[PDB]
């Protein structure tokens, strides 16, 4: 049933309310997602002026329901099976030798639009570090996100390291711990072990005055033998 909502192009709305070392900010975005091809695009706008953290640190917080699951892996798509009622996606993101984010998102259908509504809190960041100091490049590396079942909570879990390029020429690791839990309580698909393959391109709208990020992701489930 849930997969039947993702046979075409689906409109997206993203809303984030954030607070990092007490600095409050708000992000609003809309775009389109195409789970048949495992593709999505968003224009994400800061509605509160210049962001207090670099846009790349927010990429993972700002839609796993749009992964393309190959035809032989269809019974392992927890994310679509939880729709239309949706799921809660919660993370801790720990920045190497710096502070951490905690996020709670709700991913669900409102009308015919897929909404990702997020509350983010960032704690213990250093004023001269890479995040509050804006020393991260405006780009994004490709990553594999391994997905496991969480029977106890009727959901899935994931942990993965994000590599952020630093302006000097190094890398800063962002350690992600993730838990997804259904919002309703209909049956969902609990998956065998697999991973999602992510590729992301960050860009800018040359005609937009506000602080913003154009995000294009391509996502493919993989890792199940036959």
Author numbering: 3 to 64, 68 to 231
What do the paper's sentences say?
Our structure-guided screening efforts produced a YFP, hfYFP, whose stability in notoriously chaotropic conditions, including OsO4, allowed it to survive CLEM sample preparation with fluorescence retention matching mEos4b’s. hfYFP also showed strong resistance to aldehyde fixatives and performed well in ExM. The spectral properties and performance of hfYFP in cells —having similar excitation/emission maxima but lacking eYFP’s 405-nm absorbance peak —make it an appealing replacement for eYFP. hfYFP exhibits faster chromophore maturation, fluorescence intensity in Escherichia coli equivalent to mGL’s and greater than the other GFPs/YFPs tested, 33% greater brightness than eYFP and 2.4-fold greater brightness than eGFP in three human cell lines, greater pH stability than eYFP and insensitivity to chloride. Intriguingly, instead of dimming, hfYFP grew 50% brighter in 6.3 M GdnHCl. The data provide further evidence that hfYFP is stabilized by GdnHCl even at concentrations that rapidly denature common FPs (and almost all known proteins). When measured after 12, 24 and 48 h, hfYFP fluorescence was unchanged relative to its value at 2 h. Whereas sfGFP denatured instantly in 7 M GdnHCl, hfYFP persisted >3 months in the same solution at room temperature (RT) (inset photograph). The melting temperature of hfYFP (Tm = 94.2 °C) was approximately 20 °C and 14 °C greater eYFP’s and eGFP’s values, respectively. hfYFP and mGL can tolerate higher temperatures for much greater lengths of time than the other FPs, including sfGFP. We tested the same FPs that we compared in the other stability assays and found that none could tolerate OsO4 concentrations used for CLEM except mEos4b, hfYFP and mhYFP.
We report the rational engineering of a remarkably stable yellow fluorescent protein (YFP), ‘hyperfolder YFP’ (hfYFP), that withstands chaotropic conditions that denature most biological structures within seconds, including superfolder green fluorescent protein (GFP). hfYFP contains no cysteines, is chloride insensitive and tolerates aldehyde and osmium tetroxide fixation better than common fluorescent proteins, enabling its use in expansion and electron microscopies. We solved the crystal structures of hfYFP (to 1.7-Å resolution), a monomeric variant, monomeric hyperfolder YFP (mhYFP) (1.6 Å), and a cysteine-free mGL variant called FOLD6 (1.2 Å), shedding light on structure–function relationships underpinning their brightness and stability. Through structure-guided engineering and screening based on GdnHCl unfolding kinetics and melting temperature (Tm) alongside rigorous spectroscopic characterization, we produced a series of avFP mutants demonstrating superior stability over sfGFP in diverse biochemical assays. Each FP crystallized as a monomer with no asymmetric unit.
